[PDB]
């Protein structure tokens, strides 16, 4: 169901937006979770270019620079 499907998100920053914040961080801090941004919600949070539209160009061009040399 939509409400259940959305509840699972890769970005932990996105989850602390709409899920219960105390639980999200706790569950995530013990795990040593690394958030790579990638999604929309989180990039708005951290105030950089949305990884779609005009920004898709940039994120794509920068995502490939990663895992590289």
């Amino acid at each position: 169901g939509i409400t259940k499907a959305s509840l699972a998100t890769e970005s932990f920053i996105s989850a602390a937006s709409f899920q219960e914040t105390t639980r999200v961080l706790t569950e995530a801090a013990v795990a040593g979770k690394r958030d790579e941004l990638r999604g929309l919600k989180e990039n708005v949070i951290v105030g950089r270019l949305i990884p779609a539209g005009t920004g898709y160009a940039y994120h794509q061009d920068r995502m490939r620079r990663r895992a590289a040399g």
Binding site: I2, A5, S17, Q19, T21, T22, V44
Partner: protein, 502 residues
């Protein structure tokens, strides 16, 4: 420590001398919902403002009316810049004093910085991407925003005093983003259903309808004219009636070749109104599309075909012309509404006494035990429910055609030209449903329960209602407002869940 980190997972340490519990670190991140900062709202934002919105039909669809006072304060750093760029100010501190002084020299500067610089207009509940749209600003004396009427549909703006906000695209990117993506003219199709959302609304369609409509006999009957140009010439000077049957030479086009425009000229059988109108329609459309009566329904399919044949650019400027003309002739028409416009059927009192006797039949049967009690309720409710359909489609037969008028010979009848009908038939406002409450009786009402009451409103709005009839109408009315007040909260929640999962 625990009260410092997350107070509430204990006994709830209260603040000094103050009954309220003190807000902890955890309570400083958490909220409703989640992080307050990213939740609406949402962060206040520089370079912005708002006021009441008004009309301005003189606008092109790609612009909007922005108060002098607002534009001065909004673009203040730009004016300080352009002012010292052209050398009218020694320094920024002088520019500050200049626009503060409102020296007349600055107005001419502001018009420079305003030209190719879109602004964003946004109205109350932002529902789809068309809830924010980009316009080119036109300076206005007054403190209200002027909003192009065709965009009113997308915003779901009426003018009962709603206000809109403005936003200045600062960066060069934001201007080109707002110009190639958010501009009014770039978004004329709804993203929900490929159909135009910039359909002509109400005043403007009632305009065209009255124009491209015909009556049996009037000034100009039967003459023939060289082309559309001289059809207007005939009308503006009071020689011809707007709606009179007329053959005129027209030249339609059809790009039916291999992407190539073919021309066709014919003596089409039309009216003066439809002749004049063709002067707007661009090139490749057929004259058939304006040959009809043009209601709100037919008027939007026209815009649609224009898009899917000529493309974005021609449709935009076309759509402007439609609005401008519809408004103009609407004023010329002098359509109005008085008490005598709401014609009651001559048979009304009859229909009542008949269905009133029908209850008297089923009543006799209830008292004599032929029918049961719950039965009798559902019996009476049908014989009333029927009579309402009789009263409705009685006036609608009378109202629709009963303008009976003559052409040279004997007698003839046609679709009525009664004011209140033209409104519904065209689609400008009101429907035979609502009309049914003005002339015919207005239904039966039901209390909030839903259990519909066994003595309908036998009166209508042109007549008075009496004490009880109004009091019964109350329930349905109040629950109506009550419901749609909550139906505001419910819409909001469904869309929110959907973007979270998308």
């Amino acid at each position: 420590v625990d009260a410092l980190l997350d107070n509430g997972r204990r006994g709830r340490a209260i603040t000094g001398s103050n009954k309220r519990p003190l807000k902890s670190l955890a309570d400083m991140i958490k909220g409703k919902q989640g992080r307050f900062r990213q939740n609406l709202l949402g962060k206040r934002v520089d370079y912005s403002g708002r006021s009441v919105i008004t009309v301005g039909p003189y606008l092109r669809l790609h612009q909007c009316g922005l108060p002098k006072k607002m534009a001065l304060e909004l673009f203040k750093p730009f004016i300080y810049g352009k002012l010292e760029l052209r050398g009218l100010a020694t320094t920024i501190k002088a520019a500050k004093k200049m626009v503060e002084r409102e020296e007349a020299v600055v107005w001419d500067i502001l018009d420079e910085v305003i030209r190719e610089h879109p602004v964003l207009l946004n109205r109350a509940p932002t529902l789809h991407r068309l809830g924010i749209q980009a316009f080119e600003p036109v300076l206005i004396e007054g403190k209200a925003i002027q909003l192009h009427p065709l965009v009113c549909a997308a915003y779901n703006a009426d003018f009962d005093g709603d206000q809109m906000a403005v936003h200045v695209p600062l960066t060069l990117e934001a201007q080109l983003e707002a110009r190639a993506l958010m501009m009014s003219t770039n978004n004329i199709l709804s993203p929900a259903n490929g159909e135009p959302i910039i359909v002509p609304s109400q005043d403007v369609v009632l305009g065209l309808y009255y124009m491209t409509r015909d009556c049996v006999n009037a000034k100009g009957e039967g003459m023939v004219l060289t082309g559309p140009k001289e059809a207007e010439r005939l009308y503006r000077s009071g020689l011809a009636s707007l709606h009179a049957r007329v053959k005129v030479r027209i030249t339609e086009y059809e790009k039916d070749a291999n992407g190539e425009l073919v021309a066709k000229t014919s003596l089409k059988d039309t009216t003066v109104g439809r002749a004049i109108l063709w002067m707007i329609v661009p090139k490749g459309l057929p004259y058939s599309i304006v040959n009809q009566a043009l209601g709100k329904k037919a008027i939007s399919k026209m815009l649609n075909t224009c898009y899917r044949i000529l493309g974005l650019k021609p449709t935009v400027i076309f759509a402007d012309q439609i609005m401008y003309t519809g408004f103009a002739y609407a004023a010329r028409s002098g359509a109005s509404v008085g008490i005598d416009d709401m014609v009651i059927p001559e048979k009304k009192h009859e229909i009542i006494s008949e269905a009133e006797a029908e209850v008297a039949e089923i009543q006799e049967q209830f008292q004599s035990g032929l029918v049961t009690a719950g039965e009798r309720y559902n019996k009476v409710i049908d014989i009333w429910a029927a009579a309402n359909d009789r009263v409705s489609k009685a006036m609608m037969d009378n109202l629709q055609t009963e303008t009976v008028i003559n052409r040279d010979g004997q007698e003839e009848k046609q679709v009525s030209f009664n004011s209140i009908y033209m409104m519904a038939d065209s689609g400008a406002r009101g429907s035979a449903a609502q009309i049914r409450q003005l002339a015919g009786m207005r239904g039966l009402m039901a209390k909030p329960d839903g259990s519909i009451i066994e003595t309908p409103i036998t009166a209508n709005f042109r007549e008075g209602l009496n004490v009880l009839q109004y009091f019964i109408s109350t329930h349905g009315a109040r629950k109506g407002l009550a419901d749609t007040a909550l139906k505001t909260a419910n819409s909001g929640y469904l869309t929110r869940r959907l973007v979270d999962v998308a």
